Amino acid sequence: TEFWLISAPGEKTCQQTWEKLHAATTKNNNLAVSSKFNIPDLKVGTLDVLVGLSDELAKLDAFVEGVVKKVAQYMADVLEDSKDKVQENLLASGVDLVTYITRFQWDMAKYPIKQSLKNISEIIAKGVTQIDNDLKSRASAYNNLKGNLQNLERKNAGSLLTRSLAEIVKKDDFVLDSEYLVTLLVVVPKLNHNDWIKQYETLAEMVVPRSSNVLSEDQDSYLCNVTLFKKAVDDFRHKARENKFIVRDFQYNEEEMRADKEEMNRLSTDKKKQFGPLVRWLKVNFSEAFIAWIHIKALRVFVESVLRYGLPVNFQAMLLQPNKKSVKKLREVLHELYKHLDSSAAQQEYYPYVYYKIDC
Amino acid sequence: SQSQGIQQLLQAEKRAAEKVADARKRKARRLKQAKEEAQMEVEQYRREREQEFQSKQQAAMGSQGNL
Amino acid sequence: SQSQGIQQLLQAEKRAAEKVADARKRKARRLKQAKEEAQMEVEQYRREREQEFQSKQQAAMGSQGNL
Amino acid sequence: SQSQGIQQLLQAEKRAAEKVADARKRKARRLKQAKEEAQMEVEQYRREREQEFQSKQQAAMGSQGNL
Amino acid sequence: ALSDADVQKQIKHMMAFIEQEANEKAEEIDAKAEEEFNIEKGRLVQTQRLKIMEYYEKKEKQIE
Amino acid sequence: ALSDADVQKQIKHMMAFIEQEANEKAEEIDAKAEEEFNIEKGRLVQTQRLKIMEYYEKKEKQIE
Amino acid sequence: ALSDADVQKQIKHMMAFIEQEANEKAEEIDAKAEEEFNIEKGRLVQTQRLKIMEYYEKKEKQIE
Amino acid sequence: LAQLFLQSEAAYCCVSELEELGKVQFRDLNPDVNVFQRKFVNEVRRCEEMDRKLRFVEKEIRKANIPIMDTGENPEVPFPRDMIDLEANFEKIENELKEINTNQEALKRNFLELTELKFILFVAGVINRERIPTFERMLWRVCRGNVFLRQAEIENPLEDPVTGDYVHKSVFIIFFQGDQLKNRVKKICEGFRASLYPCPETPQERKEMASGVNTRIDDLQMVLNQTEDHRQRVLQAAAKNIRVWFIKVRKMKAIYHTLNLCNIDVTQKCLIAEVWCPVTDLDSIQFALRRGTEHSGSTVPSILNRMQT
């Protein structure tokens, strides 16, 4: 959606109209899209003030541009029923960019037609500041959801040495409620399954050989429970370390297992419940920020058009969609049309016409 | 075969619970008995002090009368 | 056109001076009118109230005389 | 003879050193003498003033007689 | 700029800006002046009315 | 991967360890019970014997 | 071209140089000694002579 | 060779005369002893200060293209102690030139500045006209066409203070009534090499002010002419003194060097040195010793003590 918004000296509205509407006059030999642009008539009491506002407007322009890019990123970021290449842009007030723009009007909703220029800028700035903070809080909530969800994926992921055993260990196999016999969890390579069972016996005194039994298998190792007298566990685990064996210090905990299942379901549900309304809220913020952006461009248009021409202020402008590889010619035509009207002495240094870029 | 060894251990633990609770029950009975015996000793001790009291009181009365 | 442009500038500044001085003059006159009208308002208020008091006083003296 | 000219000059230096050190010793001696002589002078002054006082006292007794 | 045509046009435009601001400002000044006229007049008048009210009360007080 | 004899031996040993503790604990509880019997008994005895001692001594003074 | 006797004469000269300084220095030292002598003496005699006189004058109080 | 015992006062005269005579060489008898130790440290430092001052003045003299000859004074070899204070007086002379230059440059800047008022008599600046093309265009774009372009030119200008270069000025200036834009153009025009010194006013009072400055400027020029005349008089005077002093100072320092090149005796305020001298010149040197010591009031024999070694 890259369009140039062009300001004209406006010496004759019927003439500027001809040079902008007529098929014989449409830019790049009528291949480029050329739509007229209008704003309500507005007056600014002091041009020097207008100048200050011009600088302010450029700054606001940058701010809201940042804001809308942030917005684009947050929508892109959720990826709820969407992807990077599908529904990349949203409608503003239900229509597309070109539609919005051509139907763009200064919104009393944004500012009184009698509102001061300063005040208009203020309204826009306050609005987007409000948008930015909304984005800050909702994005925080999004990131918090994403973070804890991945944390949970990790918990239910990985090898048997570190993975949660909630799905693996059954109350009937884990030795529960024994004062003297403690169960350690050991992970033995499949090729060494029988070996570590024998090794366990050699880890501590009074360690019962062959009690080691595999509860479940991993890709590299089997996870087995070993039952032993509590006093010997210190010797059991130490010698296990000596044999390059990792003994898992694990206790059955019914409440924790349920707690984790509850968090699993809770977090997924909140995720869905949040994204639904999150994105609807974000969608409103988007529409509002785009409308504001165009409002800003139009104000810049006001400022600029006044600054080049002063009074009277009928302002003529074009919204142009350049054709591919014809922007040089488009510029050349506009240069031919307005250069002699802009100045006898002769862009930013000099400009036959004032334009700004749209790219969304 | 590991489950039978487990059951034998569990039975041993059960016995342990019965045995310690039972020793504690005896301990409680012995304590009540201790209070009972102490009290029996006290009743006899009181009787003895009392006999001495009664002897002295009657004896003091008659000697005071002789005065 | 250098000299005509200069004269044009000086004339604009002159007009500005006239515009403001005259506005200040209009403000002063409007303020004077305000004082004249307030005095008139207070005068009518005063006359009426004094008259009301006198009427009441005349009635009061009549009431007082009856005896 | 260089060594001898040097030694002769060193002897002259030695004498110079002796001459001023001896002068400082004399200075110390002269100062103590000054203090003792001063006191001796004080004693003479005292005797003279004592005499004047006694002379005056005898004259006073003589002179107060008339008054 | 260099061309007399351009600088003269620029001057006409500037003077136009100067005039527009001057014109708007003078009307603004007179309007506020009228608002203050009515406001200040009333303020002083009401102050006096209250003062007269007190003279009245005293009148009322001396008799019965 | 071993014979039933080895598990039977090891479990017999574990059971013996528990039975041993089972017996020792009850014995320990009764021995302490015997100690507390005598300790508590004496405290009670001395407390009241001394109390009546003082009671009656004062009465004896009153008698004298 | 000049004899060892004239070198000897130069030695005798420097000796004379030394004697002159020796004399000047001793004289300077003795003169200051006499100055310090007189200064301390004067201070002492003035101090005591004044006190003696003061004592007698005060005694004039009984005579007068 | 021989051990020479020279009384201090005589020693100044003797070293001076013998050094000019040039037939004897002294050895350093105390290699472990520094100039501080030899007690020529004040003598050498003094010489060094005088030297630095002389070099400074000399440089300035050369700058002035003064035809100093330095062909006189060769045979006088003064070695009075009073020279020590006179050398300082020489420095004062040089110190004055720095002050003159200091004032002259300061004066030049005001001159460099004041000429601008005469060219002055919207605020147009004075530029070196090297970049008036972009000066004007860059100001246009500050707010294009917002104020009228003021054109000012200076013909037969004064040496530009920044470049000391005379070049006619042709300047296109933007001046604004608004404060934000005037501040803007101020920043733009100042970033450019442009001088915006004056603040022109319609009232003739400002013209009267410029007339007054023009008067002060002429007075300034007259003062510069006076400062320059003194500067010139002092510098020619220095070239005359400096040719003599180069030798005087160089020689006294050399004398001091030799005096450090000695053995300091303890018993006498006399220095004794091992001096080598050809036999051929032995009479010449004894007569030289006589002349040296004879000038001096102490009339120490100043004998060369011949020894074998």
Curated annotation (Swiss-Prot), chain A:
Q: Could you tell me which Gene3D superfamilies the record lists for this protein?
A: 3.30.70.100, subunit c (vma5p) of the yeast v-atpase, domain 2, Vacuolar atp synthase subunit c, domain 1
Transmembrane stretches in the record are none
Tissue pattern of expression reads: Expressed in brain (at protein level).
Q: Which GO terms describe its cellular component?
A: apical part of cell; ATPase complex; clathrin-coated vesicle membrane; extrinsic component of synaptic vesicle membrane; plasma membrane; proton-transporting V-type ATPase complex; proton-transporting V-type ATPase, V1 domain; vacuolar proton-transporting V-type ATPase, V1 domain
The answer to whether UniProt assigns keyword Transcription to this entry is no
Q: Name any one GO molecular function.
A: proton-transporting ATPase activity, rotational mechanism
Which Pfam families does UniProt cross-reference here? V-ATPase_C
| Cellular compartments annotated | Cytoplasmic vesicle, Secretory vesicle, Synaptic vesicle membrane; Cytoplasmic vesicle, Clathrin-coated vesicle membrane
- Keyword Transferase attributed: no
Residues carrying N-acetylthreonine: T1
Please provide the record's keywords in A-Z order: Acetylation, Cytoplasmic vesicle, Hydrogen ion transport, Ion transport, Membrane, Synapse, Transport
Which InterPro entries does this chain map to? ATPase_V1-cplx_csu (IPR004907), Vac_ATP_synth_c_sf (IPR036132)
Topology in the lipid bilayer: Peripheral membrane protein
Q: Name a biological process GO annotation.
A: synaptic vesicle lumen acidification
Q: What is its main location?
A: membrane
Biological role: Subunit of the V1 complex of vacuolar(H+)-ATPase (V-ATPase), a multisubunit enzyme composed of a peripheral complex (V1) that hydrolyzes ATP and a membrane integral complex (V0) that translocates protons. V-ATPase is responsible for acidifying and maintaining the pH of intracellular compartments and in some cell types, is targeted to the plasma membrane, where it is responsible for acidifying the extracellular environment. Subunit C is necessary for the assembly of the catalytic sector of the enzyme and is likely to have a specific function in its catalytic activity.
The UniProt family comment states:
Belongs to the V-ATPase C subunit family.
Q: What is this protein called?
A: V-type proton ATPase subunit C 1
Task: Give the originating organism.
Answer: Rattus norvegicus (Rat)
Curated annotation (Swiss-Prot), chains E, F, G:
UniProt subcellular location: Apical cell membrane; Cytoplasmic vesicle, Secretory vesicle, Synaptic vesicle membrane; Cytoplasmic vesicle, Clathrin-coated vesicle membrane
Q: Which residues carry this modification: Phosphotyrosine?
A: Y55
Q: In which tissues is it expressed?
A: Expressed in brain (at protein level).
User: N-acetylalanine (modified residue): where?
Assistant: A1
Its quaternary organisation is: V-ATPase is a heteromultimeric enzyme made up of two complexes: the ATP-hydrolytic V1 complex and the proton translocation V0 complex. The V1 complex consists of three catalytic AB heterodimers that form a heterohexamer, three peripheral stalks each consisting of EG heterodimers, one central rotor including subunits D and F, and the regulatory subunits C and H. The proton translocation complex V0 consists of the proton transport subunit a, a ring of proteolipid subunits c9c'', rotary subunit d, subunits e and f, and the accessory subunits ATP6AP1/Ac45 and ATP6AP2/PRR.
Q: Which family does it belong to?
A: Belongs to the V-ATPase E subunit family.
What function does the entry list?
Answer: Subunit of the V1 complex of vacuolar(H+)-ATPase (V-ATPase), a multisubunit enzyme composed of a peripheral complex (V1) that hydrolyzes ATP and a membrane integral complex (V0) that translocates protons. V-ATPase is responsible for acidifying and maintaining the pH of intracellular compartments and in some cell types, is targeted to the plasma membrane, where it is responsible for acidifying the extracellular environment.
Q: Write the protein's name.
A: V-type proton ATPase subunit E 1
Swiss-Prot record, chain H:
Give the classification, highest ranks. Answer: Eukaryota, Metazoa, Chordata, Craniata, Vertebrata
Compartments (UniProt record)? Cytoplasmic vesicle, Clathrin-coated vesicle membrane; Cytoplasmic vesicle, Secretory vesicle, Synaptic vesicle membrane; Melanosome
Tell me the first and last residues of the signal peptide: none
Sites of Phosphothreonine modification:
T202
What is this protein's name? V-type proton ATPase 116 kDa subunit a 1
Which Gene Ontology cellular component terms are annotated? clathrin-coated vesicle membrane; cytoplasm; melanosome; membrane; perinuclear region of cytoplasm; plasma membrane; synaptic vesicle membrane; terminal bouton
Q: What does this protein do?
A: Subunit of the V0 complex of vacuolar(H+)-ATPase (V-ATPase), a multisubunit enzyme composed of a peripheral complex (V1) that hydrolyzes ATP and a membrane integral complex (V0) that translocates protons. V-ATPase is responsible for the acidification of various organelles, such as lysosomes, endosomes, the trans-Golgi network, and secretory granules, including synaptic vesicles. In certain cell types, can be exported to the plasma membrane, where it is involved in the acidification of the extracellular environment. Required for assembly and activity of the vacuolar ATPase.
Q: What is its main location?
A: membrane
Which cysteines pair up through disulfides? They are none
Q: Which residues are exposed on the Cytoplasmic face of the membrane?
A: 1-309
In the UniProt record, what gene is named as encoding this protein?
Answer: Atp6v0a1
Keywords assigned by UniProt?
Cytoplasmic vesicle, Hydrogen ion transport, Ion transport, Membrane, Phosphoprotein, Synapse, Transmembrane, Transmembrane helix, Transport
